Amino acid sequence: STGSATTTPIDSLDDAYITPVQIGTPAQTLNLDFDTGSSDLWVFSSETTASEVDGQTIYTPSKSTTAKLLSGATWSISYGDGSSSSGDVYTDTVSVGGLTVTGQAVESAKKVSSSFTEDSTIDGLLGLAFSTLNTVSPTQQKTFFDNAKASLDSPVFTADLGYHAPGTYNFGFIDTTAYTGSITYTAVSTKQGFWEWTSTGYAVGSGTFKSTSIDGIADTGTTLLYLPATVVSAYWAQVSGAKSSSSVGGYVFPCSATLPSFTFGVGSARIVIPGDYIDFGPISTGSSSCFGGIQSSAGIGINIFGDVALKAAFVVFNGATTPTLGFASK
């Protein structure tokens, strides 16, 4: 089997992407944030504290003839950005782009943090990291991909995120029309539960490539590109007037600037992030100070190839017995 679904930016900045997901019988369609940096599929629901729902579409398990409470199971997750959610668990039928999994754990939120409430466009998350990170207790549950894998034509999914435009998540096949040149595959460590890999270096604008190993994660659920302070300083030094602002929480730059591109290495291959992808607009409405899309990972504890990086590529998440990651230009 295969599946193919369009993923759409939630706003004009590409702060996140949502993908429609069918849950239950009859189908209830929720728009979920596909997150290769976590491993829980959780949704706003009829069980979510009412004051914490503000415009989201909810899953109502009592209206699904295929929903079954997973007795005794609870979940609770905290994300890198400080947000969190928790609740109980159902199993139900979940379909993405025509690919159907029966008995998928659907984690129903009883509580969500303010960041989730305040974002009316995201109805929940669909985790695509390794199932070892799944938070369901006392019996850990499998991700949608892990459940689907054996049925797929090939044990892969691909992320093709758009810049200020829709893109595609495919399951079970590689669309050879969706990228240019070849896909370069690179080794993955699953030791931390992430799609963790080592970039071979970087360049800033038309500058020379610096060969240096940068370990990080391919994370569709993180907006920005978080890299070591040395790398980030080298980038922003090429933008007149850019500075790190403690009060704002990262590098800012004059909105009048033209940003240079940023290149990252995948083996001997190179992915070029155009300068415009690095612009996250005014820090506050009407400001002429703009927020940068490349930020320091210092004190995150890990480098994160988030959407800023991934949207410059066609990305293969290869879930073969030994997982790997592939990147192509597009």
Domain boundary among 151, 174, 197: 174
Contacts of 66 (CB under 8 A, 6+ apart): 24, 25, 92, 93, 102
- CA angle 274/279/284 to nearest 5° reads 175
Strand partners, 117: none
Q: How far is CA 163 from CA 89, 178, 277, 280, 329, in A?
A: 35, 14, 7, 12, 13
Please name the amino acid found at residue 220: T
Solved using: X-ray
| Residue with tokens 């369609």, as numbered in its chain | 29
CB neighbours (10 Å) of residue 301? 7
Domain boundary among 174, 191, 210: 174
Contacts of 169 (CB under 8 A, 6+ apart): 3, 4, 5, 7, 19, 34, 96, 97, 157, 158, 159, 160
> What CA–CA distance (Å, rounded) separates 45 from 56?
9
133 and 265: one domain? no
Beta strands 3-9; 17-23: pairing state? antiparallel
CB neighbours (10 Å) of residue 296? 19
131 and 230: one domain? no
Inter-residue contact 23 to 30 (CB < 8 Å): yes
> What CA–CA distance (Å, rounded) separates 55 from 53?
6
213 and 235: one domain? yes
DSSP-derived letter for residue 93 is E
162 and 233: one domain? no
266 and 278: one domain? yes
**Annotated catalytic residue, options 33, 35, 88, 219:** 35
> What CA–CA distance (Å, rounded) separates 98 from 116?
27
Look up 199 and say whether it is catalytic: yes
Q: What is the CATH number of the domain that holds 19?
A: 2.40.70.10
If we measure between CA atoms, which residue out of 179, 202, 200, 187 comes closest to residue 278? 202
Strand partners, 247: none
118 and 262: one domain? no
Given strand 294-296, what is the order of strands in its sheet?
269-273, 262-266, 196-204, 210-218, 303-305, 225-227, 294-296
CB neighbours (10 Å) of residue 109? 26
Look up 35 and say whether it is catalytic: yes
78 and 224: one domain? no
Domain count, the chain: 2
154 and 192: one domain? no
94 and 208: one domain? no
Beta strands 41-43; 124-127: pairing state? antiparallel
CA 315 to chain centre: 12
CB neighbours (10 Å) of residue 22? 18
**Annotated catalytic residue, options 39, 64, 108, 199:** 199
> What CA–CA distance (Å, rounded) separates 70 from 170?
29
97 and 185: one domain? no
Contacts of 229 (CB under 8 A, 6+ apart): 296, 297, 298
238 and 198: one domain? yes
150 and 232: one domain? no
Domain span at residue 48 reads 5-174
Inter-residue contact 170 to 3 (CB < 8 Å): yes
For residue 254, the SS3 value is strand
Domain boundary among 174, 192, 213: 174
